[PDB]
Amino acid sequence: PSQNAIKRFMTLFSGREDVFSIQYEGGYRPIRRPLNFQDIKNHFSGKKTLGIYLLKKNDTVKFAAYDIDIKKHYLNREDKFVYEENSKKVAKRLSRELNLENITHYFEFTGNRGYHIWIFFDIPVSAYKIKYIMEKILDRIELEEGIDVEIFPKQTSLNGGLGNLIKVPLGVHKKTGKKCLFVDNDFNVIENQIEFLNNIKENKATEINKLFREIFNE
Numbered sequence: 001p002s003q004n005a006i007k008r009f010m011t012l013f014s015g016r017e018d019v020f021s022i023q024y025e026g027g028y029r030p031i032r033r034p035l036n037f038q039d040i041k042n043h044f045s046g047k048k049t050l051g052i053y054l055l056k057k058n059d060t061v062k063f064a065a066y067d068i069d070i071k072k073h074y075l076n077r078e079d080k081f082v083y084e085e086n087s088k089k090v091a092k093r094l095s096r097e098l099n100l101e102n103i104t105h106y107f108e109f110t111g112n113r114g115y116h117i118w119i120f121f122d123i124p125v126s127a128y129k130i131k132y133i134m135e136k137i138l139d140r141i142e143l144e145e146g147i148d149v150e151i152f153p154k155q156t157s158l159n160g161g162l163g164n165l166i167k168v169p170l171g172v173h174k175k176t177g178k179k180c181l182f183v184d185n186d187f188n189v190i191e192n193q194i195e196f197l198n199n200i201k202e203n204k205a206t207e208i209n210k211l212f213r214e215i216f217n218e
Ligand SMILES: Nc1nc2c(ncn2[C@H]2C[C@H](O)[C@@H](COP(=O)(O)OP(=O)(O)OP(=O)(O)O)O2)c(=O)[nH]1
Pocket: 026, 027, 028, 051, 067, 068, 069, 110, 111, 112, 113, 114, 115, 165, 166, 167, 168, 173, 175
């Protein structure tokens, strides 16, 4: 049911369970209480913009992302559109490598200067294991001009803190006022974002753990 979309969002983007953050003009501000359904409604309606701390208190994550960015000094150039196309080329190259490893994943236009490739897990996996897998996969490719790729999580041990946060889809990027939206593998905006969210598929933690071991053992 479409009414289950907020619950699904909360389940898929499940990070630190007693703190989250919101975007402000100048950074992200921690909110020291659990995320709730009204917060997600505020995100969807463009009143607030959520950043989720990926790491749970036992140093696991239920989701991870590649963060594909056009470098800032390439955005002011006359041929800026070439670099927008290059960001899609990089996303497609990484997607091919993820597909070869049977890692189900989803593209998001981030509302400003690139894409996220989201990876979801049925139950949380060790942050260092998924980071290592994603680094080894990224090492398989080369990047077009103007593009960087980051891996979230970067910090894989909390050490008492909050760790990294990532802006989650379906809200508004405060830097631009643009919506952050799921896109298909040809980078077209998905028409029905709620139905798309409701049918996102999670990867099996047992398969991810096996992949970590096999890459680690090579
Ligand atoms: N605490 C804090 N976290 C930030 C800040 N800026 C970004 N982050 C986090 C949330 C972002 O989703 C994530 C990646 O940063 P990016 O600059 O790549 O932004 P994002 O990918 O959300 O959109 P964009 O690259 O601008 O299209 O890092 C900041 O100023 N303060």
